[PDB]
């Protein structure tokens, strides 16, 4: 007698992890970037760059 085409069934689980990294920024160089008070020359200074 013949044979039948067998097959199997597999169930797998998703194992969860997570990575993280961080940096900072100095309070002295905070307002130097976003601060829109600098009118005419500090907007193209060297320390801003």
């Amino acid at each position: 007698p013949a044979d039948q085409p067998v097959h199997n069934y597999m169930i797998k689980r998703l194992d969860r992890r997570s990575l993280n990294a961080a940096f900072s920024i100095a309070v002295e160089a905070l307002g130097l970037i976003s601060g829109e008070n600098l009118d005419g020359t500090h907007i193209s200074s060297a320390m801003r760059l």
């Binding site: 020359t41 500090h42 200074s45 060297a46």
Partner: peptide
Amino acid sequence: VIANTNLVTSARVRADL
């Protein structure tokens, strides 16, 4: 004023005096 290395070569207040 903050310049790079580029180079060239009133009111009436109350007071005592």
